Amino acid sequence: RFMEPYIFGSRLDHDIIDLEQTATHLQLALNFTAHMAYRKGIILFISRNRQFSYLIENMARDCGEYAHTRYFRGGMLTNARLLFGPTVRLPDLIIFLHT
RNA sequence: AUAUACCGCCAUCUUAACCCUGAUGAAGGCUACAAAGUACGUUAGGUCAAGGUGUAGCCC
Ligand SMILES: [Mg+2]
């Protein structure tokens, strides 16, 4: 339901995403990502689609950022101090290629 | 006579945290082609034979 305002219409029962809105949303998201990378924030890419795990991990390594394409263990973020250490620094921005 | 006086020696028995979910109810938390889970005393005991320190008994 919450995706309806972003849908241009249904073509023979297939939803078409309105790309005029995608352009503005992508503009905002890319601007935010660039500003966070300028501030030396930790950026974590996340995606559980196994078809693109290798691509996303390579891209994360290439841009000097972080990836988590594997099974997401309970408490990675909310229990990070127990899992990583008391002084671990969490990501400042998380990007989902697949939500 | 007493270790049913102690000591020695033998033997008997006794000796968590964090994080999530449920409307932050009682409560619950697994799937790998992965979906919240991760970290000494005790004994009416034996032994007075390879050992001791005491205590009492009778003493026409
Ligand atoms: Mg005895």
Per-residue CA distances from A29 to A76, A78, A80 (Å)? 24, 24, 26
Compute the distance from residue A74 Cα to the ligand 1 centre, in Å: 65
Q: Is the CB of A78 under 7 A from strand B?
A: yes
Find, among A94, A87, A99, the residue nearest to A43 by Cα: A94
Element (H, E) at A82: helix A80-83
Resolution (A): 2.5
Polymer length in residues for chain A: 99
Find, among A63, A68, A78, A74, the residue nearest to A98 by Cα: A68
**Which amino acid type is present at position A47?**
S
Residue A40 and residue A92: Cα distance in Å, rounded?
9
Nucleotide nearest to A79 (CA to C1'): B19
Q: Is the CB of A79 under 7 A from strand B?
A: yes
3-state secondary structure of A85: coil
Nucleotides of B under 7 A from a protein CB: 17-20, 29, 32-39
Q: Are strands A7-11 and A66-68 parallel, antiparallel or unpaired?
A: unpaired
